[PDB]
């Protein structure tokens, strides 16, 4: 039974944007949760449905590892039952969520002198997302009463905005990578266990 591919998920070179967060399925391997927890780099490690020490023994059906880069101040919104731009329009965690949220500062990778503006987030949306929705559409918004009809006027905003990551921005505005592990702990044939 081979080791789980956590190294790829946590040491990937380039992370995805917020609005198009990549989901990596994991299954049929021996998970090693001790390694990740023991490391000290992870600024915020929060497990919701379970306890972090229990993880070494539980057996799950399969687990999803999401990844994206968000601003430091908005990390809180990645949690069940909160709101904001990220929760409402980008990435909504369902209530009764069961998994672990992992985040760490990445100012030495995702921020370069002159600013890094390649990480985008959705700002204007008609309605909130359903849990784990991944709306990648770039439909022209309409904040004015007049119909926009696909012409980007002064009230026909493009619904994506790019973060501005200066190398010397405050800790609040520095880019934090986020990995969310979601364990759907059904009683279907267990595929991922800890030694």
């Amino acid at each position, epitope marked *: 039974t081979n080791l789980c591919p956590f190294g790829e998920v946590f040491n990937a070179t380039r992370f995805a944007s917020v609005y198009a967060w990549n989901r990596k399925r994991i299954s049929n391997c021996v998970a090693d949760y001790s390694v990740l927890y023991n490391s000290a780099s992870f600024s915020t490690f929060k497990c919701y449905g379970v306890s972090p020490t229990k993880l070494n023994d539980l057996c799950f059906t399969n687990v999803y590892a999401d990844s994206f880069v968000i601003r430091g101040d908005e990390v809180r919104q990645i949690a069940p039952g909160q709101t904001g731009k990220i929760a409402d329009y980008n990435y909504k965690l369902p209530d009764d969520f069961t998994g672990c949220v992992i985040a760490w500062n990445s100012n030495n990778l995702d921020s370069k002198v*002159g600013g890094n503006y390649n990480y985008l987030y959705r700002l204007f949306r008609k309605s909130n997302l359903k849990p784990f929705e991944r709306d990648i559409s770039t439909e022209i918004y309409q904040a004015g009463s007049t119909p926009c009809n696909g012409v980007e006027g002064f009230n026909c905003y493009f619904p*994506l*905005q790019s973060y501005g990551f200066q190398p010397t921005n405050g800790v609040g505005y520095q880019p934090y990578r986020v990995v969310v592990l979601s364990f759907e702990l059904l009683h279907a044939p267990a595929t991922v266990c800890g030694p």
Partner: antibody
Amino acid sequence: QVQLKQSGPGLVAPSQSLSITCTVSGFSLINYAISWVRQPPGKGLEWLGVIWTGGGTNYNSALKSRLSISKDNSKSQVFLKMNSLQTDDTARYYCARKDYYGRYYGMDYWGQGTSVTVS
Amino acid sequence: QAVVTQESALTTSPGETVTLTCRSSTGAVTTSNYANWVQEKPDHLFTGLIGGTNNRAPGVPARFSGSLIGDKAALTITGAQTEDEAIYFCALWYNNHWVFGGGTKLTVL
């Protein structure tokens, strides 16, 4: 710091087409729009056209539709192209930033200007 | 429907405020036609002063202030001689395009 650069020797011969480039730092092309204006020597400036935040253009009405503006978000560059030039077009051209998402609904910042002279 | 006109002649002694009016060809300027004020340095340097008919650009001194004080758009300034020798142009957003006025030459004292 927000900054606008545009560069080119410029000088043109009649009936050919030459293009100018605008290079930007300190702001992202997704959060703003870029407008181009043209300044014949000693006269009032006229507005050529705008490239909106994510593509899609407007142009000056009577100005020739045989011209286009284009951009590259990756390198933070903007290009104006005209496909045929006439001697009245000899002018200084300027890049400009339009901040219509937030507070300042006009041309927030302006470039250093490039001379384009035909003959 | 594109003609916009300015006086193009101005003089304010230091400390005294003046108003320059830019007027459209659609009657009194609407709020929709957002007003813009730009400043011309004598070395071919440009900057933006007022947008949206009320908003100062970031980093412009609070001494500068404007609005639709009269039915046509206009701008006002308290007199600071050294840094206010400049040309100023008014711009109006018609829904189809932006139109720029001829511009007004300010000659303080």
